[PDB]
Write a protein that binds this ligand. Sequence first.
Ligand SMILES: *[C@@H]1O[C@H](CO)[C@@H](O[C@@H]2O[C@H](CO)[C@@H](O[C@@H]3O[C@H](CO[C@H]4O[C@H](CO)[C@@H](O)[C@H](O[C@H]5O[C@H](CO)[C@@H](O)[C@H](O)[C@@H]5O)[C@@H]4O)[C@@H](O)[C@H](O[C@H]4O[C@H](CO)[C@@H](O)[C@H](O)[C@@H]4O[C@H]4O[C@H](CO)[C@@H](O)[C@H](O)[C@@H]4O[C@H]4O[C@H](CO)[C@@H](O)[C@H](O)[C@@H]4O)[C@@H]3O)[C@H](O)[C@H]2NC(C)=O)[C@H](O)[C@H]1NC(C)=O
Ligand SMILES: *[C@@H]1O[C@H](CO)[C@@H](O[C@@H]2O[C@H](CO)[C@@H](O)[C@H](O)[C@H]2NC(C)=O)[C@H](O)[C@H]1NC(C)=O
Ligand SMILES: *[C@@H]1O[C@H](CO)[C@@H](O[C@@H]2O[C@H](CO)[C@@H](O)[C@H](O)[C@H]2NC(C)=O)[C@H](O)[C@H]1NC(C)=O
Ligand SMILES: *[C@@H]1O[C@H](CO)[C@@H](O[C@@H]2O[C@H](CO)[C@@H](O)[C@H](O)[C@H]2NC(C)=O)[C@H](O)[C@H]1NC(C)=O
Ligand SMILES: *[C@@H]1O[C@H](CO)[C@@H](O)[C@H](O)[C@H]1NC(C)=O
Ligand SMILES: *[C@@H]1O[C@H](CO)[C@@H](O)[C@H](O)[C@H]1NC(C)=O
Length: 1836
Amino acid sequence: LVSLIRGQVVTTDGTPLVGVNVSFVKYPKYGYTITRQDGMFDLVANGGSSLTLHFERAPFMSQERTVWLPWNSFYAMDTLVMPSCDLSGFVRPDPVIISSPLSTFFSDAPGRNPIVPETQVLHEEIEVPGSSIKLIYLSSRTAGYKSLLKIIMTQSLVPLNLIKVHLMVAVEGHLFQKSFLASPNLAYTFIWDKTDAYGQKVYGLSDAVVSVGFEYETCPSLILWEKRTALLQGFELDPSNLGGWSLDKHHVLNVKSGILHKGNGENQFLTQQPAVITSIMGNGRRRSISCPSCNGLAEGNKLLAPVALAVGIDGSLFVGDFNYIRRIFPSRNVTSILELRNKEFKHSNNPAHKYYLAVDPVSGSLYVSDTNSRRIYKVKSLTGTKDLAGNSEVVAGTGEQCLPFDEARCGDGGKAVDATLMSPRGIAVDKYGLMYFVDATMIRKVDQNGIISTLLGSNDLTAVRPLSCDSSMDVSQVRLEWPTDLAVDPMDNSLYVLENNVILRITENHQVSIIAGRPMHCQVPGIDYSLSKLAIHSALESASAIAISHTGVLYISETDEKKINRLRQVTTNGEICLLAGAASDCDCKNDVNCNCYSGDDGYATDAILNSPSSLAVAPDGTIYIADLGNIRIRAVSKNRPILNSFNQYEAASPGEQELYVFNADGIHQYTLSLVTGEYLYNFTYSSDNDVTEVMDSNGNSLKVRRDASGMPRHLLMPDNQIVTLAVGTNGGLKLVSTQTLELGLMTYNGNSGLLATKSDETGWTTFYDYDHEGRLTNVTRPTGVVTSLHREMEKSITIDIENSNRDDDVTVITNLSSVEASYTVVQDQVRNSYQLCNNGTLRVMYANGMSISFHSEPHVLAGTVTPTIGRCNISLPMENGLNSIEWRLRKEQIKGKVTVFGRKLRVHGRNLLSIDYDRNIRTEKIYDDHRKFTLRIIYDQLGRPFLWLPSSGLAAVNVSYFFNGRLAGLQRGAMSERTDIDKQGRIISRMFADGKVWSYTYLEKSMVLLLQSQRQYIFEYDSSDRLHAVTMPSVARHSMSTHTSVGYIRNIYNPPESNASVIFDYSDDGRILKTSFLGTGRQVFYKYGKLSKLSEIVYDSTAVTFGYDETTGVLKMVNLQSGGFSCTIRYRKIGPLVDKQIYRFSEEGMVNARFDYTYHDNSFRIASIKPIISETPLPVDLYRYDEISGKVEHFGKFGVIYYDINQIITTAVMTLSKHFDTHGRIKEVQYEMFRSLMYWMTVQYDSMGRVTKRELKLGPYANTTKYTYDYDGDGQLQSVAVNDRPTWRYSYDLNGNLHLLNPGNSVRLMPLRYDLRDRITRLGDIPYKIDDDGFLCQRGSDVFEYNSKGLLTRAYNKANGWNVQYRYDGLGRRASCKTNLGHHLQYFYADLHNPTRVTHVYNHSNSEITSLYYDLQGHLFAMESSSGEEYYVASDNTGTPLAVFSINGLMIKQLQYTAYGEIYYDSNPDFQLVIGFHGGLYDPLTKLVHFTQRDYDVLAGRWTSPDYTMWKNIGREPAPFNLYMFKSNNPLSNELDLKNYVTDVKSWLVMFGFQLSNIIPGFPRAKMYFVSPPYELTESQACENGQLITGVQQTTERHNQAFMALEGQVISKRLHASIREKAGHWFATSTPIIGKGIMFAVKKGRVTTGISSIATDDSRKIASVLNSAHYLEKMHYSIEGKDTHYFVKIGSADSDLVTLAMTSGRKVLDSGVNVTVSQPTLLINGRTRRFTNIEFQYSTLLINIRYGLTADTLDEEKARVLDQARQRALGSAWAKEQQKARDGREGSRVWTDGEKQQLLNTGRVQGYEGYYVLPVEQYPELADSSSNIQFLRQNE
Ligand SMILES: *[C@@H]1O[C@H](CO)[C@@H](O[C@@H]2O[C@H](CO)[C@@H](O[C@@H]3O[C@H](CO[C@H]4O[C@H](CO)[C@@H](O)[C@H](O[C@H]5O[C@H](CO)[C@@H](O)[C@H](O)[C@@H]5O)[C@@H]4O)[C@@H](O)[C@H](O[C@H]4O[C@H](CO)[C@@H](O)[C@H](O)[C@@H]4O[C@H]4O[C@H](CO)[C@@H](O)[C@H](O)[C@@H]4O[C@H]4O[C@H](CO)[C@@H](O)[C@H](O)[C@@H]4O)[C@@H]3O)[C@H](O)[C@H]2NC(C)=O)[C@H](O)[C@H]1NC(C)=O
Ligand SMILES: *[C@@H]1O[C@H](CO)[C@@H](O[C@@H]2O[C@H](CO)[C@@H](O)[C@H](O)[C@H]2NC(C)=O)[C@H](O)[C@H]1NC(C)=O
Ligand SMILES: *[C@@H]1O[C@H](CO)[C@@H](O[C@@H]2O[C@H](CO)[C@@H](O)[C@H](O)[C@H]2NC(C)=O)[C@H](O)[C@H]1NC(C)=O
Ligand SMILES: *[C@@H]1O[C@H](CO)[C@@H](O[C@@H]2O[C@H](CO)[C@@H](O)[C@H](O)[C@H]2NC(C)=O)[C@H](O)[C@H]1NC(C)=O
Ligand SMILES: *[C@@H]1O[C@H](CO)[C@@H](O)[C@H](O)[C@H]1NC(C)=O
Ligand SMILES: *[C@@H]1O[C@H](CO)[C@@H](O)[C@H](O)[C@H]1NC(C)=O
């Protein structure tokens, strides 16, 4: 094409000349330029060919300079200044060039984590109301984000004579020059502003030319130069033009650089993807020698034998097609230009008849050199004349072969035409027009005059020295053995020789050196470290051809003709890698049944070549291969989108299942579904190509209302809502707002475009700091938390990530090479490795020992432009640990259009599942390979799934949509739930299939949910749709608030007319830190360690530690320590899988346990469990599975049969048959023993899935009992009839409290009483007591002791004389139960998939172990004793045991329960059953059923504690609720949820018994929990999963998720409006003390504040006072409900009092913040002190500052706050102890009658004092905790 030249002309000193006439003459093209004051010359010339330039000046010598021009680039010419010394064996410069990585990383959740560590990028977002389209900010899409180039020119060792080092950097016309002095480890970092020489923005990717010169003391005039190329990222295109922000769905394609810039922040550098191979000439068949119809199109045109290739100055490819020389024009047409009369059809593949081509860059002359004719020819006419046989002229040679020892030296010194040649081989023509050629074993020159000479002069055997491995010697010392190909480097102007599998370089200074290949001089032990990526250390296997690109890249052809047929690439850095040609399993030359032609229109590295003979590099950088064996010319091109028949470009995202359509200019037209082919988004533009409308598939249009210049004004949302956009004078988006909400408020750093601040409606301001390079260095939050990023750019780029509040330091190390980008994420000694290879492979090597390898293939629909993960190879650290998953993609085309898109999932060559989409009928067929499962998903005209048609006669699921595409209703047979919406899109009605209607009324931020029973719930909201208050039907108002605190976000819930606050403290990343119950003082502290995983849980006097392995990072230990008692759980793992679980106890009587696990070969499936309880080995339980479905076929002694969705559990003795209805609900259970029916149950449901009828037969001879259930207007259980006779009646409060029941078997109707907080107070005559935290305290004479974690530690009754104590493990599970009546049991959890499931019970009274066996629904069905006894359990639809049968099929126990779980009949009370009502642990003493997180009272029919986490989502999903009610007062039916409407393939598969989790490693296992497990338990399972801190970790996750995706499209199953959710913010935000626009940072306990433009004057006053203060770390407490934080200031308060404009008292600011100035006098440990005290307070948040002058000020305040907290802890502990004595309850210590009386009268006991159990020195957070205090006398 066309190139641009730019250079400077200077004098001797360095002054630019004001008058130089720069001239150039080439073909008919003429031109000249005259330099100005700057001394710069700018010229336009044709690229590729060599151009000579003349310079004219008056008092200076007129000089000429010839240069090799790049094809279509901006050439920066060397500076012009207006020979005796010889450097041989001197050290050449070997620079290490490190470029800043490409911005390929982005965030999956910019709202959760905006930090991209590796590229130091800020990825932010703004959610807008009325649309799912977001506004995205990416800090790399700015002017401030510069391109870096670290050039390490010297190492630790400097050559002795080196004095000066010179540097040159050439980027887009710019020429940077700098001189340095010789120093060890000398480096310079070049910064590019992404502009050209004219100050214009450069888009995409650019090439930099780095030149390093070495000046020696021996010769100061000459400098040893070395040229290297580097890739620099330019400006990213801005598609949306919204003040530096983009629309989430709006993309742009850079057509020139081949980059897909997605609006969501995702950048796809398409040219950096695997290279593509295509056939440009030939059809694999030979043409006739006469060449008939050889003049036409190149593609498919028959060849004979392509032996030579050369690219002309025109861009034409000259083909040495044996007999004829054919020219391929840029128009892709072929014309024969020369016929060689000495070529015969027989000698086509003969090496003796092989000739070589070369193009002269001065004049486009083509030179031919035939080895057989012993001459060199020049083609006369390159257009081809009539007589083609005589279109050549002799350049060199007469035709006769001269003898090796010629006297006249084969005509040297004279004319080339008259001279004689030995055997001419490879030819190359220099920049100056000098012709070079290989003549037998030497290199000969043919100059401009026509005189022949010898460069590498042979026969001088005396001066010849063997080839030096490291140093470079002169031409005279070099001897050549079998040289073939020759080429000139268009960047160096050096000559490259291919000689006996070694490539050598001849510089312009006649210096020879090895560039590629390993000679026998230093073969072994030449290199001790062996394998390396360098070309010098890699041996060449039968090399045949060489080619050099204009960027100095060397390509080497290697052909063995048998199996080795490949093309390798050698980059400027000296690294060698495979470019094309896979290793063929078949012999191409010997084997007759062989095809060595494949891979065309696919990836080059996968393709199989056959005998490559010649290479040539095209103007665009594509490599041409003379594939002689396949009679074709093949092209290895950069991966690029191709213009289709419609003049459009197509790119795709397989992960999002989207296809993007762009016009010829790369402007985004449409987004279609990659599966469905239906339009998802349509983009319309203005005349200036500015985006004005985004129209989705549903008809929702988001209009961008613009100005005539394209300036954005506002967004017109699909609901006709206006979102105001205010762009600043710097061009940056300043404000995003609605008529009520301020969605975003942004400031920028000058005109760089770098986001300085970003605020939301809550007033939360985040501050961003960058370095001079525009890389993110700090992120400061209003919590005072700072995230810091530090870069160290060396041979490897290291980024250090630190947080001010945590010790979780993360470091990312990046090593970029020719083959791969290598990443290492380090957390202490735990190292995770990631490798992103050029072939498209992503390899993860986890610290745990497991490795995952994702492999890319071209997409079947989108082509080579989009690689897809079609293979996944997993490796576990074990004997048979290799696993493999495969996705096989297919297509069906009718009339050139896609009809069917098929995907098949395979494991070890077997089909598991097939997901096929038929575009004609709009159906998605999901089917099994063995006729077991079939599901059809029907899509509507808008491309939305609306109907799910399953097999086995199951009820179909169908959905309704509103006009805007939002889900309107769901239906599954007779069951349906519909909604109606406002004009505002708010739900106004909710209709159920039973006729139940809920109304939703909206009145000024308040919502009123009314039921037909006239029960009313009022939800009061914020502008941000977060709850302020909830009024219950009882008219009791619950209140909530959220506020930014110091180091966390505090969420407060206040019960009605109470100050007993329930607080949930969350970190900035959304992790729980503290759970507080201010009513009694209950606290749970959560700590996170160096691996960013849970490290400690502290509550009361109990400390739970989580130990991780120093190297693997896996959870090794969980240790609970509560004084003397210790409970330790230890794990051993095979990668992330548990293979050993140990239980250890410190207690005297308690027994230990061990569980050994084995896994099935080549899987993640558990094969066996071997238990050892109390050093007594138990029998091994074997697990057998179906390899196609993951179905458990055998477990222990039980066998499982699957038919449709029904299951049969069999043994030689028993058969348990479970029958399910069309809705997947249990309809019949049939338990048979010895071919006789022992138990049968039938369940019948109403339209809504409520149990209406249950028939039960308990025993083979017992009668059948019929139970009928009736529900009230709200679906609450009203009555229960036994054989059509009313037996039970239930009634409820307006709040849903059960206030009337028939207890047990009684006819009597008993009333239940409640308080305003819904806490029970009475059950008939029996009084109940619930504490201020909401926990069960007393039931008449029964006393209950619940700890801070909400676990029952002790329960007793002094009157009835019974006492029960419980012990728990570190994961919150009940470990033991011990009574004063002899009972002592221990519980174990051996099931890895169900960690809350009690699998084994150790009984201390008989020393026997009971093994519990559960069915596929989780219900108990069998038991096995270590004594040899076997029991068979009959369980109901809720998993409640109703009957037990002996080993001989005899009913030994029969239970009858009420609807709420109270036992009224027991045939054998002495037979103790561990599992009770609803599958929990039933206690006959307490009458409670224990589930790991909550306890259930069977007498009251409610939970013993509230689930305060309900408050988190009740605002988003408003519904009738009660904190204590059991299953919405429907205890026999499965809880009603939207999950009952099966709208996803994985959920349909689960129903059919399929367990994809067992066959697809990593696939999510379906959760089988009634009660949600505690945080630490779910965390202990998920901690083995890969972290997501860095960008490479997030890239890996995208690969994992895209591989596990089943359906082509998934619906958003939500019948509620989408709410903008913040991390750790649950409720309506309280006004912050740290105002909007104020920066607040707490680094190592030191406070620093900053101010932005938007900050108010009163907010700046608080900032000024808080600056330079010292925060009392870990010493912040909840005092009288207040979130009090302590600070100290060393100096006088005078300066700060002037700022506050006050002297003393209280002042109220504009925000409402209270400022109190006082001078208190404190008495701490007998020491009196008076100081100034400034207090800042808003609602519960309180910030206190103490002023001092001494250095001990911080230490004195620490001693003051701890003593005050000690007084609070002691005051509370003694009060609680006195209350225990008053109530008649058992105290913490055993007191005598005198001690007890002293406590009752005074409040304290003489000689006794409260001491900390957990030391306050290590646990300062427990300083005010009364539950951490123990009363002891001085005897200890
Ligand atoms: C942890 O370990 C603990 C052990 O350290 C463990 O506690 C022990 O648990 C077992 C099993 O539950 C207890 O044994 C039971 O004892 C029952 C009490 O009966 C006593 O009183 C009677 C007087 O009224 C005596 O006649 C009777 O004597 C019999 O037992 C003696 C053994 O001590 C023996 O030497 C005698 O020869 C004599 O046979 C005894 O002293 C007892 O009732 C009970 O038996 C029933 O249950 C067995 C299964 O558990 C059946 O195999 C057996 O056939 C019995 O069933 C019948 O009775 C039930 C209840 O009435 C009915 O539900 C049945 O349908 C059935 O009824 C039919 O048959 C009757 C005639 O047999 C007839 O009258 C009916 O009309 C009907 O036709 C069992 O042996 C043991 O005492 C506990 N030990 C201690 C120290 O606590 C604890 O459970 C473990 N915990 C966990 C969680 O695992
Ligand atoms: C699911 O499909 C059924 C059809 O099988 C839809 O039911 C129809 O609903 C209309 C009212 O909208 C009634 O007039 C028809 O009589 C119903 N058809 C029959 C015979 O079932 C139903 O609306 C769909 N459900 C949802 C929520 O999309
Ligand atoms: C909830 O309110 C009660 C009553 O206002 C507070 O209890 C009082 O606290 C003061 C100071 O500690 C004592 O002098 C009183 O004797 C207490 N009254 C009684 C009878 O308890 C209580 O501290 C408040 N709690 C919270 C969480 O703010
Ligand atoms: C600023 O301080 C005043 C006074 O301490 C707070 O007002 C008191 O609020 C309580 C509880 O709402 C009332 O019982 C008192 O009667 C109020 N006293 C006065 C004199 O107003 C006020 O709430 C504080 N401001 C904020 C936003 O926390
Ligand atoms: C290329 O060759 C075809 C014959 O195969 C001919 O029809 C066409 O006109 C040619 N085009 C050019 C570039 O002259
Ligand atoms: C920002 O981070 C760097 C990390 O090298 C640190 O040196 C610096 O003190 C930080 N500054 C702020 C704003 O805390």
